[PDB]
Amino acid sequence: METWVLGRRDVAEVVAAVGRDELMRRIIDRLTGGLAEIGRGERHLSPLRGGLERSEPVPGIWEWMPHREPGDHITLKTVGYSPANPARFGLPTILGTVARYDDTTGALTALMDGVLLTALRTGAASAVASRLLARPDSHTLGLIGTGAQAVTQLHALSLVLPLQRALVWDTDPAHRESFARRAAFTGVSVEIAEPARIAAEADVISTATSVAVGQGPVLPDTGVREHLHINAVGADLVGKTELPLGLLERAFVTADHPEQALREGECQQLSADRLGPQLAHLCADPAAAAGRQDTLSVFDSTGFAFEDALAMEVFLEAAAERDLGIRVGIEHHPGDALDPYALQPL
Amino acid sequence: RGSHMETWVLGRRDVAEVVAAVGRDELMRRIIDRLTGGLAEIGRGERHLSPLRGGLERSEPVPGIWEWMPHREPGDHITLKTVGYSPANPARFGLPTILGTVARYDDTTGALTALMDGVLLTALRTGAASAVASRLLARPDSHTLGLIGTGAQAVTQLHALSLVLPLQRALVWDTDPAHRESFARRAAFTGVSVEIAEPARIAAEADVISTATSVAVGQGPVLPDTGVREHLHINAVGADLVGKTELPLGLLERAFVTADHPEQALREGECQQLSADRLGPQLAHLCADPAAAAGRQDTLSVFDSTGFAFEDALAMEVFLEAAAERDLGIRVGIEHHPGDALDPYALQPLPLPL
Ligand SMILES: NC(=O)c1ccc[n+]([C@@H]2O[C@H](COP(=O)([O-])OP(=O)(O)OC[C@H]3O[C@@H](n4cnc5c(N)ncnc54)[C@H](O)[C@@H]3O)[C@@H](O)[C@H]2O)c1
Ligand SMILES: NC(=O)c1ccc[n+]([C@@H]2O[C@H](COP(=O)([O-])OP(=O)(O)OC[C@H]3O[C@@H](n4cnc5c(N)ncnc54)[C@H](O)[C@@H]3O)[C@@H](O)[C@H]2O)c1
Ligand SMILES: O=C(O)[C@@H]1CCCCN1
Ligand SMILES: O=C(O)[C@@H]1CCCCN1
């Protein structure tokens, strides 16, 4: 009958009401269970997503990401990757919204912010993969790219690993300078450090950069620690990669969405047969990751709509708890179904 | 650190006010004029057809489809219509078969700038498209309009065609007796005389016909192949699933056929049934060079309409212009734009009561 809209201010209230740590953990839990269900064949990976490339001011892409729950609802995330946004407009690079449509009737039932939600579920996905593939006594996090994702990468990982410090690099000096402030709520100290030092000293690394197509790697193939786990998070355009090939070829690599990663993720650099089990399989049967915490591992993260549906559910339950949001009659639902012009006055 | 951006939302009450303030006729005429100019632009090569739209089949309660329809104007904005075809809707839920919304995103930043009802808008630009094709392909003295399917689309087909042709009568059929029986009431505001008539009579008498039905896959045709007037123009409007068609093959093969979006029509329209050599020049071509419609008025013609996002963009602009002039709609901060672009957690709670 009406659309439930949660805006920027409701999303802020959700985070306050739940707590940043608890909210992240909720999403981590829901992702874990959902992924296991996919891994058991009980739910399906989202279909491949579509997109429109944009040249100006620098190259980006704008995408639609559907996920259907047959007989309940369709989720669609509409989201932009616009890497000039912070410097040119004071806007996040990743800018989006997430909509829910009733599957039986098509009606738009809910609409909310995609920015916070994307950051949270992306951080969560790394935590999921890192609980399986990083040493549980991991103490040093490395971060290449210290923009918006870096924050929830650090946050999420600090919740599943006993992190004591983060060594961080960004090619924009102002962005690496501000990271300690943005990270300080998590209690993990932060030290700026060049890619070679991060490689050599980190136990777990997340790369989440706006690197250009064809300009990788963002982490050099120097010595790494034997047990290093890398969450490879950066991903927008085809031809965009973050890690060096020689590193990928020696790694146990798991993808979030193998078909998508082979096209848009680090797995662009590999053939399918060289991938370990996908993330959903590992979630469904964690013992299949058994010795991999102690050897070189890569989680190839690209993002997919199921993760957004799950995260949106978490938000909606919290917002329901505290009746946040407004209700807007957006759709024209004429009482006369058959009359476009039955516009409604009582 | 720019001006705080929010989403301009026009809900059902706002679209209703636009119609009331501008007037029905004037509003439809505006849409026809903007579709006309835009199609000519595509026909001159100054703009491009929308890309193929996407969609998710649904089985239950009866077979249906939910689609996303993008159109991008580079460096300007992206339009996305999200829309359901759910044909059990009216008779199982009392909802419109076609249920949708139209959203606009800034092309430079990705920001969601506007969002409105898709229901009225879809109906208006779809009637408008048929008006465009019918001005080109119907006899300009056409007096008798046929309608097969008397649901939501039928209403704007009649309305739009009444503005471009001297329509005197509408002969109308629906396989659901309740839906054809209510049609006159819904059509009354056009002034055009309505009579219920079987498909064979509609075929025999009409100068122009619109088919706009929820016929199921494999269950066509909705108009039988039995003798029409030599000059008949048909706006073939029904379209959802592959395997859904409304016209007899035989008839299509006697007609000058023009599609709105050929690549799309060849897959999802009446041209599903046809090999590509049986299509004439597309609608955009005809709009850009009407002489290419020469002589087609006096013989059998078919406009194979499927709908495409460009039409929704243009219609949405007409609506936004009228809403801006009349101060309508609300402003909602939907997207989180943190004061620090690189800090997802730089959040702003509802300010405290003072
Ligand atoms: N895997 C997923 O699910 C997922 C989800 C969201 C975003 N992303 C992607 O993650 C990437 C980052 O997104 P974001 O929101 O943090 O954007 P952002 O602009 O806030 O952060 C990008 C940062 O990378 C830095 N950078 C660019 N090139 C670099 C290089 N060669 N070395 C080090 N730093 C470099 C920039 O200076 C900037 O600080 C994008 O590609 C985005 O599409 C992935
Ligand atoms: N081409 C476009 O741009 C465009 C735009 C919108 C909708 N559509 C399509 O137009 C069609 C109709 O949409 P609507 O909004 O009017 O749906 P509606 O449900 O409002 O009207 C459909 C009518 O068709 C009737 N019907 C079903 N089978 C029939 C038959 N064999 N003969 C006569 N009537 C029959 C139903 O009884 C119903 O009354 C759908 O296929 C829809 O997807 C096309
Ligand atoms: O899953 C996501 O939200 C992002 C959007 C941008 C490119 C792909 N990864
Ligand atoms: O163009 C449209 O709006 C419709 C939507 C439903 C099926 C396809 N045609």
CA distances from A240 to A253, A336, A340 (A): 17, 51, 46
What's the rounded Cα separation, in Å, for the pair B226 and A20? 70
Q: Find out whether A108 and B334 touch, Cβ atoms under 8 Å.
A: no
Residue B191: alpha-carbon gap to chain centroid: 22
User: Atom 4 in ligand 4: which residue has the minimum CA distance?
Assistant: B307
**Ligand 1 within 6 A of CB of A171:** yes
CA distances from B276 to A45, B249, B280, B352 (A): 36, 14, 9, 65
The number of beta carbons lying within 10 Å of the beta carbon of residue A325 is: 23
Q: Which residues contact B329 (CB under 8 A, 6 or more apart)?
A: B8, B9, B10, B11, B14, B323
Residue B73 DSSP code? E
Residue A198: alpha-carbon gap to chain centroid: 22
**Which among B121, B119, B86 has a CA at the least distance from the CA of B100?**
B119
Residue A263's Cβ-count burial label (10 Å; 0-12, 13-18, 19+) is middle
* DSSP bridge pairs for A201: none
Residues placed in the known binding site of A for NAD(+):
93, 121, 148-149, 170, 175, 210, 233, 235-236, 240, 301
3-state secondary structure of B333: coil
3-state secondary structure of A56: coil
Tell the residue number behind the tokens 């806007």, with chain if given: A91
Question: HSE (CB half, 13 Å, CA atoms) of A256?
Answer: 32
Closest-approach residue (CA) in chain B for A47: B56
Q: Report the sign of the C-alpha dihedral through residues B195, B200, B201, B207, in that order.
A: positive
Task: Give buried/exposed letters for B26-38 (b at 16+ CB in 10 A, else e).
Answer: ebbbbbbebbbeb
Angle at A336 between CA A333 and CA A337, to 5 degrees: 60
Question: HSE (CB half, 13 Å, CA atoms) of A218?
Answer: 29
Residue A186 DSSP code? G
CA distances from B117 to A2, A59, A343, B267 (A): 12, 32, 12, 27
Q: Find out whether B31 and B125 touch, Cβ atoms under 8 Å.
A: yes
Angle at B219 between CA B213 and CA B223, to 5 degrees: 55
Q: Which residues contact B24 (CB under 8 A, 6 or more apart)?
A: A341, B159, B189
The number of beta carbons lying within 10 Å of the beta carbon of residue B21 is: 14
What's the rounded Cα separation, in Å, for the pair A159 and B126? 53
For residue B273, give both structure tokens.
């049934």
What's the rounded Cα separation, in Å, for the pair B312 and B314? 6
Residue A222 DSSP code? S
**Which among A324, A250, A65 has a CA at the least distance from the CA of B68?**
A65
Residue B326: alpha-carbon gap to chain centroid: 25
Per the omega criterion (within 30 degrees of 0), is the bond before A258 cis? no
Between chains, do A89 and B112 touch, taking CB under 8 Å as contact?
no
For residue B195, give both structure tokens.
């009579």
The number of beta carbons lying within 10 Å of the beta carbon of residue A286 is: 14
Q: Which residues contact A195 (CB under 8 A, 6 or more apart)?
A: A144, A169, A218, A219, A220
Between chains, do A119 and B344 touch, taking CB under 8 Å as contact?
yes
Closest-approach residue (CA) in chain A for B104: A78
Q: Find out whether A43 and A31 touch, Cβ atoms under 8 Å.
A: no
**Which among B34, B49, B31 has a CA at the least distance from the CA of B306?**
B49
Which helix (H) or strand (E) segment holds residue B98: the answer is strand B98-106
- Indicate the resolution in Å: 2.2
What's the rounded Cα separation, in Å, for the pair A112 and A120? 14
Q: Which residues contact A242 (CB under 8 A, 6 or more apart)?
A: A144, A207, A209, A211, A216, A217, A218, A219, A232, A234, A266
3-state secondary structure of B85: strand
3-state secondary structure B264-331: HHHHHCHHHHCCHHHECCCHHHHHHCHHHHCCCCCCCEEEECCCCHHHHHHHHHHHHHHHHHCCCCEE
For residue A228, give both structure tokens.
């290093």
- Minimal CA separation from A208 to chain B, in Å: 12
Question: What are phi and psi for residue A314, nearest 5 degrees?
Answer: -50, -50
Q: Does domain B121-304 have CATH number 3.40.50.720?
A: yes
**Which among B216, B217, B188, B215 has a CA at the least distance from the CA of B199?**
B215
Which helix (H) or strand (E) segment holds residue B113: the answer is strand B112-117
What's the rounded Cα separation, in Å, for the pair B213 and B87? 9
CA distances from A70 to A77, A96, B301 (A): 17, 24, 40
The residue extents of the domains of chain A are: 1-134+304-346, 135-303
Instruction: Name the residue type at position A221.
Output: D
Q: Find out whether B314 and B35 touch, Cβ atoms under 8 Å.
A: yes
What's the rounded Cα separation, in Å, for the pair B271 and B260? 11
Q: Find out whether A256 and A301 touch, Cβ atoms under 8 Å.
A: yes
- Minimal CA separation from B215 to chain A, in Å: 16
Q: Find out whether A178 and A114 touch, Cβ atoms under 8 Å.
A: no
User: Atom 1 in ligand 1: which residue has the minimum CA distance?
Assistant: A302
What's the rounded Cα separation, in Å, for the pair A307 and A121? 6
What's the rounded Cα separation, in Å, for the pair B93 and A136? 53
Which helix (H) or strand (E) segment holds residue B187: the answer is helix B183-187
Between chains, do B150 and A9 touch, taking CB under 8 Å as contact?
no
Q: Find out whether A175 and A146 touch, Cβ atoms under 8 Å.
A: yes
**DSSP letter string, B193-253:** EEEE--HHHHHHH-SEEEE-----TT---SS-SS---TT-EEEE----STT---S-HHHHT
What's the rounded Cα separation, in Å, for the pair B33 and B304? 20
3-state secondary structure of B122: helix
Question: HSE (CB half, 13 Å, CA atoms) of A92?
Answer: 30
Determine the distance separating the centroid of ligand 3 and the alpha carbon of A13, expressed in angstroms: 25
- Minimal CA separation from A96 to chain B, in Å: 7
For residue A148, give both structure tokens.
């918006």
Strands B112-117 and B193-196: unpaired
Residue B204's Cβ-count burial label (10 Å; 0-12, 13-18, 19+) is middle
Which of B156, B157, B240 for mutating ligand 4's site (highest number of atoms within 8 Å of CB)?
Answer: B240
Q: In what order do the strands lie in the sheet with B169-173?
A: B193-196, B169-173, B144-148, B208-211, B233-236, B301-304, B256-259
Method: X-ray
For residue A64, give both structure tokens.
């639609």
**Ligand 2 within 6 A of CB of B152:** yes
Q: Find out whether B87 and B311 touch, Cβ atoms under 8 Å.
A: no
Task: Give buried/exposed letters for B82-117 (b at 16+ CB in 10 A, else e).
Answer: bbbbbbbbbbebebbbbbbbbbbbbbbbbbbbbbbb
Between chains, do A333 and B118 touch, taking CB under 8 Å as contact?
no
What's the rounded Cα separation, in Å, for the pair B207 and B50? 31
Task: Give buried/exposed letters for A130-166 (b at 16+ CB in 10 A, else e).
Answer: bbbbbbeebebbbbbbbbbbbbbbbbbbbbbbebebb
- Closest ligand to C-alpha of residue B173 is 2
* DSSP bridge pairs for A192: A168
What's the rounded Cα separation, in Å, for the pair A1 and B99? 12
What's the rounded Cα separation, in Å, for the pair B7 and A58? 24
Breaks (C-N over 2.5 A) in chain B follow: none
**Ligand 3 within 6 A of CB of A115:** no
What's the rounded Cα separation, in Å, for the pair B34 and B40? 10
3-state secondary structure of A234: coil
**Mutation target among A44, A61, A105 for the B interface, most CBs of B within 10 A:** A105
Distance between first and last Cα of chain B: 27
Question: What are phi and psi for residue A185, nearest 5 degrees?
Answer: -60, -20
Q: In what order do the strands lie in the sheet with A60-69?
A: A50-54, A60-69, A73-81, A94-102, A108-113, A3-6, A326-328
User: Which residues from A are below 8 Å from B120, CB to CB?
Assistant: 332, 340-341, 343
Instruction: Name the residue type at position B14.
Output: D
Angle at B145 between CA B139 and CA B148, to 5 degrees: 130
Rounded CA Rg of chain B: 21
Question: What are phi and psi for residue B345, nearest 5 degrees?
Answer: -90, 0
B81 given a catalytic annotation: yes
The number of beta carbons lying within 10 Å of the beta carbon of residue A335 is: 10
Between chains, do A62 and B335 touch, taking CB under 8 Å as contact?
no
Q: Find out whether B51 and B70 touch, Cβ atoms under 8 Å.
A: yes
What's the rounded Cα separation, in Å, for the pair A261 and B14? 43
3-state secondary structure of A300: strand
E-strand spans in chain A? Answer: 3-6, 50-54, 60-69, 73-81, 94-102, 108-113, 140-144, 165-169, 189-192, 204-207, 229-232, 252-255, 297-300, 326-328
